[PDB]
């Protein structure tokens, strides 16, 4: 399997740029930045203060060196500095503050305006890192930030974001539950930026449907059949047969017969302003089992959901 967009990105670049491995910090005073307030991560002097975790140190390469290549990105959170405490040798990065405004106070008033706005923003991130080789893995309403009064975006946490090079296998370990693409759920490995597409789009769900999360799986194979409940099984079988996907036993007695519905069941009252057919079209070109058959984050930008969006730019 292979990526539609930015596949060999990396190829064409100098080693330095991917090989995280290779990536020698240099770590600072955090006595520049003290604890003022907790969100883990703290505010300080403004500034936000990750303190790296009982994490291997190689995982810690691929974070400051994939920051270093999204800086100057839009709407992808920036690296002020990466430091230590001189007490505690621990590693720390620092980013800039952007006030939060937690999704699930925002989320509920939002306008069928804000909506394509906040996912036209997200869309400019994930294209433009996607265009840098990297994907996000970790695309979920909480690494969105926003700024309702200021209207400004940016994702965050880079703890798990890969370099993507072509044909390599990554792990279908990563992702919040909810976020987690079919890719992850059936133990496929060799997945792309396409992922974060059904993150992303899985949001879209949420935002116009209010219900969040859409699929709200109970646990990482109720995560699937909630998803076939939706998108139909045939549908899935095929795509399984498509990869030559061994399917986990334990799938056996939990899926069977389901059928693709009509993204219009989700209507009622309370969310009615909030869908539109542009909404409904965007959606299913983005929640689609096949990784590949996905809209691109560039393709996304362009479609009809946009026009409110892109005419006020
Ligand atoms: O891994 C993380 C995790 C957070 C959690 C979180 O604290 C949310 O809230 C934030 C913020 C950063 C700046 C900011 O201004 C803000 O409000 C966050 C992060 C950045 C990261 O890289
Ligand atoms: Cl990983």
């Given at each position: 399997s292979r990526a539609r967009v930015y596949a060999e990105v990396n190829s064409l670049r100098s080693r330095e740029y991917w090989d995280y491995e290779a990536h020698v910090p240099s770590w600072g005073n955090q006595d520049d930045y003290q604890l003022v307030r907790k969100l883990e991560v703290f505010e300080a002097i403004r500034v936000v203060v990750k303190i790296l975790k009982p994490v291997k140190k190689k995982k810690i390469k691929r974070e400051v060196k994939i920051l270093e290549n999204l800086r100057g990105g839009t709407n992808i959170i920036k690296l002020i500095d990466t430091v230590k405490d001189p007490v505690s040798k621990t590693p720390a990065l620092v980013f800039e503050y952007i006030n939060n405004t937690d999704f699930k106070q925002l989320y509920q008033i939002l306008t069928d305006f804000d909506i394509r706005f906040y996912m036209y923003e997200l869309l400019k991130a994930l294209d433009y890192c996607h265009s840098k080789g990297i994907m996000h893995r970790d695309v979920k309403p909480h690494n969105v930030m926003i700024d309702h009064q200021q209207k400004k975006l940016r994702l965050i946490d880079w703890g798990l974001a890969e370099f993507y090079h072509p044909a390599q296998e990554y792990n279908v370990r990563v992702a919040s539950r909810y976020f987690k693409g079919p890719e992850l759920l059936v133990d496929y490995?060799?997945?792309?930026?396409?992922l974060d597409m059904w993150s992303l789009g899985c949001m879209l769900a949420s935002m116009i449907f209010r219900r969040e999360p859409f699929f709200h799986g109970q646990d990482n194979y109720d995560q699937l059949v909630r998803i076939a409940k939706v998108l139909g099984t045939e549908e899935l079988y095929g795509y399984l047969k498509k990869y030559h996907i061994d399917l986990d036993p334990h799938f056996n007695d939990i899926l069977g017969q389901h059928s693709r519905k009509?993204?219009?069941?989700?209507?009622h009252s309370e969310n009615r302003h909030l869908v539109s057919p542009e909404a409904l079209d965007l959606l299913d070109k983005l929640l689609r089992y096949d990784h590949q058959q996905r809209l691109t984050a560039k393709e996304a930008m362009e479609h009809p959901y946009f026009y409110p969006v892109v005419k006020e730019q």
């Open positions: 490995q060799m997945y792309d930026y396409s009509r993204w219009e069941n989700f209507i």
